[PDB]
Each structure stands twice: as C-alpha cells, then as structure tokens.
Design a binder for these strands. Sequence first.
RNA 1: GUCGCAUCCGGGUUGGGCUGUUCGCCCAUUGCGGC
Lengths: 260, 259
Amino acid sequence: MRIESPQNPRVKALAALKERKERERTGRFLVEGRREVERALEAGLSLETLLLGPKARPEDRALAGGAEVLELSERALARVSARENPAQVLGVFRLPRRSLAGVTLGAAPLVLVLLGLEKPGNLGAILRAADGAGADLVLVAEGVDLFSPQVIRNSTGAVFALPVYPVAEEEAARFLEEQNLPLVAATPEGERLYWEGDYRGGVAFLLGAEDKGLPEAWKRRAQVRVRIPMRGRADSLNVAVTAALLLYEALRQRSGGAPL
Amino acid sequence: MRIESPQNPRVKALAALKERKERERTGRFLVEGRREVERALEAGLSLETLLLGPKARPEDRALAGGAEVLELSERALARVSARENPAQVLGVFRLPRRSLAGVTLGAAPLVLVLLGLEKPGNLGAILRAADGAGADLVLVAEGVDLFSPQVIRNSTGAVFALPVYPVAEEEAARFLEEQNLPLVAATPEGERLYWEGDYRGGVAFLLGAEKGLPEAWKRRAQVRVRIPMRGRADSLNVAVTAALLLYEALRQRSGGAPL
RNA sequence: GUCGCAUCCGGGUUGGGCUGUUCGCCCAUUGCGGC
Ligand SMILES: C[S@@+](CC[C@H](N)C(=O)[O-])C[C@H]1O[C@@H](n2cnc3c(N)ncnc32)[C@H](O)[C@@H]1O
Ligand SMILES: Nc1ncnc2c1ncn2[C@@H]1O[C@H](CSCC[C@H](N)C(=O)O)[C@@H](O)[C@H]1O
C-alpha cells in the first residue's frame, strides 16, 4: 500500500503514537530509524507495520518478515516522524511485556536506579552508558516513558535489549531489599567522593530527578551517599553524565583499579 | 511604561536577538532564566536591559544594577523567549570579546580541545562537564557560537565563566605546542584504555564532534585512548565522553593511579 | 495588551512544571489571523 497525502487517516494514527497516552491506548509504539528498527527486531519485538520512505533501500523491505509494508511520501513521512529530518525506515511494534519476576542477578551485579527522571534524552543517554559499562539492571522508577521517541534515539536502540524495567518506587525499594543490594545514593552533597566507594561487590547506584534530585527517604536508605566533585560554577552535573561517571568508576574498579 | 503588545517596536528588536547575525551586529545577546541571568552577572558580563515578566519576584528587579528594566506582558515575553513556556527573568547582555592571547596556564593544566563543529545542545552539555571537572581551558573551532540559547541553557549558564576560546586550528596547535602539553586523542579505536593514560602532569584531551577527529591530530597525539564499550553501542554521547575523560584526569590528580 | 474570525458550550477554546532548548521537554486536564 502506497500513501501520499499527509492527511491520510493512517498517517494521523501513526503520528498519534508519539503521545504516551496513544501508546497506552493502542498497545503499540513507533520505532524510528534503520538502526533502531534493527535493534527492536533483533531483541524479539513484534513488528506490525513497516514504514518505508522514498530514499529507503531494497534491503529495508526484507526486514518486514510478514508485517504490513507501507510506502510513504516525503510529506507523509514528515508527519509521522519525531525528527526535524525524518528517517527513511520506521516500525510500528507491539509494546513489550517485561517483568522483574524473570530476572536473576549474579554475585556482584552493577545496577542503576533512576528515580523520577523527566527528560527522555537523559533516560536514553543513561541507557547508552549502561550499555557501554555492561550494567546488569536498570530500574526506572516513575519517570518519563521508556518507549518515548527520544529514549529510543538517544539510546541508539539500546533500550530494546538492555535489562531495563519500569517499576513503581515502592517496587524498586522492595526489589532492592529482596536482592540484598547495597544502595549508593549519588547526590551533589554526598559525604563521600564517588572514587572512595568500593563497587567491586554488588552495588545499586541511585540517581534522582533533574529538578529536585533524590528524595530524602532514598538518601537515608542508602548505605553511603557519594558525590562527584564540582570545581566550577555549575552546582550539579547532568543526571546522565552522573550515571556514566558512576558506571565507569565501577567498571574501572572491576577492571583492576583500586578505590581512592 | 509596561510593554504589553507583542508588536511593540522594542519587542521586535529584542526578538531579533534570536539570530546570531543580529547578535553580532548589535553586540548583544539574550540570557533567559533567573539561574542563567544570575550566572552571567556573577561571571562579570554587562547587563544592558533586564526583561521582567508578570510573575517576576521583587528581588529580580534588584538584579538590574542600573540597566534599563522593562516590564513585559506574557504575550510580549512569548515573542522574545526561545521557549514554549517563557522564563519571567531575561537579560540583554553585551557580547563579551575574549582572546586567547592573554591566557597563561599553570604547570599541570587540564585542557579540552573540541575539533569540528558540534551541535549547540551537545556543546552546552560538554561545557557543563568541563566546568564541573574544572577544565583550565577549552579550545573550540573559530566559528563556534558560545552565546546561542542552547549553549546557555544546556551549560546551566556555566559557559559564562568557563575559559572557552573559539580559535583557528593552527592557533590551537600552536598554543598547545608552546605549552609542551601532552595531547591525548579520544577515539573508539584508541590503543589504550582512558584509565591507562597518565594525566597527573597535564593533559590536553582531543575530542571530535558527535564526526570524528582529523587524522593529523590523532597521529600527533602522544596517546590515543578509548572508553570501553561492553555492549552493542559503539559510542557514547560527546558530553558523556568529555566528562569521563576530564573526571578521570581529576581522579588521578586527586591521588588516583593510572590503571 | 487588544480586535476580528472560526469553532465549541451565552459562556470555553486551558492550567502548571523543567539542572539538555529546540520541527524544546514534562505533567494535569478539558483554534486561525490582525493591530
Ligand atoms: C558520538 S562519538 C562519534 C564517534 C566519532 N565519529 C569517532 O569515531 O571518533 C563523538 C566523539 O566522542 C568520542 N567518543 C565516543 N565514544 C568514545 C569511546 N568509547 N572511546 C573514545 N572516544 C569516544 C570520540 O572522540 C568522538 O570524537
Ligand atoms: N555532583 C554530583 N554528585 C552526585 N550526584 C550528582 C551530581 N550532579 C548530579 N547528580 C545526580 O543527578 C541528580 C539530579 S541533580 C539534582 C539537583 C539538586 N539541586 C540537588 O542538589 O540535589 C541528582 O539527584 C544526582 O543523582
């Protein structure tokens, strides 16, 4: 089926998926970009509709594997895309079902706990860093939706394969207690420099919201509160930069380095 | 005195500052956000006009220091702002003009050399990381605009006091040579892990745009270092890379040993 | 600020928030111009 008019009803339906409410109502979501579509397919997500733009290449069509295939003009593509410059390959996938029930951790896991994050770019960047550092688990507690377009783009598709689970704040606390994982709260006023923590054992790093930071209750639960030094005018670092810094310090230590 | 119409001639001139062309012509630029205005002031920049919206606080007016204060309606504010939901505190500052010529670094400086043209939002975030880690100097391409709205917003205002200088490549190479600063190229294919470099005596990190480094710079570097990537992702965001590198140097200057 | 015109029930065509701001972002809800 070929579609030209940006006013085609399917195009309005497709463009609607950029909204979290439509994703919840339909159970489906949009994945934009060849790499991102590849990663969703490779992660086992169920493709319902492949969207091909005018400058798509022959191999793109072979990705559909039985899903409906729609050709879109540059005009209709522009409406469906979340990007100033539209990608040429997109996929409508069924939202995945994932629960922490099936998750088992090894002896010394590296875990990230994200509490209240609001900016989808920050979440995507954290997921990219978690991929780089080999994080064993990412718990997203009450933040922006994991399948927001910018999470997919900023994660370069890593959101689909990463062990990342949206959880309620209370379930995060429960799961952390159940797993007996030591909690390390990252907070700018933390009493200990982050380099001075030992992360060779199992560890869960707690990161707070971009505006208000970690709730006092969560800082209290942690065994230790760590800080990343601020030597200039900024009072705080970006949440994703902080997560990366913590993950790589732990990786440094797990790669042979000694705590400070 | 209150300015209520978006069509007021003064609103027209203030909104024109959204264009770099106009900022260069007038020598003025807009800083949106109490936090950012505060940081511009504390950085020593010259406030020419303070813009106050209907919800500004009494203390906001006292920031003016003899600048003209304009009270703007929400409708006039929306025309000047770069945001769907504007700030109540905006400031028209004089564009600072800084040259590298004066700069003298100490014995063990922490320097970041950004090669290529980076997008504004990424640049802003790179400069915040640099501010956080206490970079002694940041060198960017000659045509880099450091007073765009995204650089101010994504830097959390850190760009105003940060020693960042848009310079020609030869000027950059020359400055680094004349300080005898070890150059460390960050590249995914680096021969060494970034933790293995020794940054206790001074370092100039070379980082390309989110892009790649030019080959001449990679070869000239004393060491090419990589950040380990244990999954499918082949690269990290440039701002994250910048932070990882700068905080590693800080780690080593804080008693840490190279891996 | 204000004035048409739509549209919806005369009365509405919204509130808020934001340490990544850009075809900005988030959250409750329930339009298009002119001067
Ligand atoms: C998003 S990366 C793009 C990669 C870039 N084209 C290259 O090959 O260097 C942008 C910048 O981040 C740096 N970078 C990103 N990930 C890195 C890693 N794992 N190791 C070293 N440098 C990295 C590179 O120096 C690069 O200039
Ligand atoms: N310098 C730093 N040290 C440790 N954690 C930091 C940090 N900068 C940012 N973070 C992390 O990023 C999150 C958002 S920063 C929140 C800022 C708030 N003014 C505050 O002071 O808490 C924080 O909750 C923390 O998890």
